[PDB]
Amino acid sequence: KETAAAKFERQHMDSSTSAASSSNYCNQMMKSRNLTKDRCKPVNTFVHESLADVQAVCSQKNVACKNGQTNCYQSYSTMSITDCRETGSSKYPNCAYKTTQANKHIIVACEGN
């Protein structure tokens, strides 16, 4: 019930697709991942890489986090990601999100979990 590690997996992992397929991807995913349950989560990123590859970022480039903490890591390589963002025409419970597909280096915070 929810460990920090399982929570990251639920909110950001989507290894079953190489990339967002349509404009409706964020709407279906935000929902099935239970991100629109209580409210509408405003912003969320989905990574389309294997779990192992995403876990491997924690052994990659050490960088400072936006808060000053230094447990952040940047992937050496670019990864397939999908940015999900609430539109201005979104309202609980009719959550609407704009899907933006991209290939970027991801930055994650890691914990010896």
Binding site: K7, F8, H105, V108, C110, N113
Partner: peptide, 11 residues
Amino acid sequence: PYVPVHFAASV
């Protein structure tokens, strides 16, 4: 082990 707990950024 040492695993991702938060998605900070992209690029």
